[PDB]
């Protein structure tokens, strides 16, 4: 009985926009930041996980802001991740 | 007598897209998510193993939702790997 | 009772115009450097921390040492950030 | 009385590539997969060691196998490496 | 009472480039190598301190050897830095 | 009394045109392959250390064979390196 849903993510080229994105994803929905990761060729992905509407506001925020500093390569919102997808997701914590 | 078939595998430009590919790969499919490596230039590489069948409808449902978000370099399915390529497998574990 | 507002960045193509950008934050306004980051493909960010009028002076400043010598990617300032966003700032301190 | 011929070599832009290239190297003769290393720009590289003829073959048909799937940035038979060589080799075993 | 002026940077593409420079800087001059980073995107810099008329001279013997044989990104002379770019300055002795 | 001239470099892109460079440059001239560096953006240095005439020849030869399999960077030989550009080859060891 050990103890750790809606995953959303945004990718910008530039570690400023990803802050950008970060602070308004926090800031406009009842998300936790959960994931940050740098995989080279400047692009940068923060996640952030919680209720299913809460994420897909959160993901839109962050793109709006992202969008009006850098470049924004890509967005998504997985609903309900598959379990495994969790041992990708843990090695961005 | 030391106990540890098919490989699966989606190169994309940038995280995002190869989560989800991941996530694709792991719900339309019985296969296991082994691999995951960055290696720079932003391509980001997600290996699944499973039998045959089930690695190739992995990699062709995850190139579609990959393929939706960002950009997908290449896609292979090794049907039986040669032993000696697991040496390499095992580093991106 | 634990002891630790306003967040400047500023992220050029390469480190010599990012070095021009922090002396020039520091010279023009009362600011600490508090961040410093390369990514990869060449982005380096430097992140000044101070009140909000003394932020903005900083980032103009360091905008206009860093942009003649050098490619400045891109430039923002936070005046508020999210607690969650300090998460992300100090994993670059 | 320390103990530890030809070398071939295929670099590849992206992983995919280089581990179809591989398993084609490995498959095709007899050939031991003794190198393997990713220095950025996705280029990555896998090295095989064996008789001369043997390298030959195993590059010939690592070549036809990668080229179909990715790009290959090139490849090389080393018939007689110079043993100073080995100091470099070794790094990426 | 602990004891640990001017700054010369040279930023070039390719590390041959930059150690032409810092070769050059040295000869040239009375001045100390005291930095070396390489940041991606083959952006090396090379720095040196000394006084201002030294590093001045040292700055501009190192362009021209440098711009013979590469790319030179940048190259700045920074007088009197400010105190706290002594610690980016630092993480690049 | 501790005890540990003239220094070759050639920089190619790719790992596989180096390789070729080092092995032609051992081969053709009495050197010594003392560096070996990657630094980003597929840039890979070798480096050799010997007599002048033997680090000119080896270069040369280094050179000649790299350009038929990949793309030489560039290439120099530095006579008599500063002493102060020790501190920066051993980084390369």
């Given at each position: 009985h050990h103890h750790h849903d809606?995953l959303?993510?945004?990718?910008?080229?530039?570690?400023?926009?990803?802050?950008?994105?970060?602070?308004?994803?926090?800031?406009?929905?009842?998300?936790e930041?959960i994931?940050?990761?740098?995989?080279?060729?400047?692009?940068?992905?923060?996640?952030?996980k919680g209720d299913?509407?809460?994420?897909?506001?959160?993901?839109?925020?962050?793109?709006?802001?992202?969008?009006?500093?850098?470049?924004?390569?890509?967005?998504?919102?997985?609903?309900?991740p598959?379990n495994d997808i969790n041992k990708?997701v843990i090695?961005?914590k």
């Amino acid at each position: 009985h050990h103890h750790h849903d809606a995953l959303g993510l945004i990718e910008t080229k530039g570690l400023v926009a990803c802050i950008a994105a970060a602070d308004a994803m926090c800031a406009s929905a009842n998300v936790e930041l959960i994931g940050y990761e740098n995989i080279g060729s400047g692009l940068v992905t923060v996640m952030v996980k919680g209720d299913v509407g809460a994420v897909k506001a959160s993901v839109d925020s962050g793109l709006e802001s992202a969008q009006h500093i850098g470049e924004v390569v890509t967005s998504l919102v997985i609903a309900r991740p598959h379990n495994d997808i969790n041992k990708i997701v843990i090695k961005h914590k």
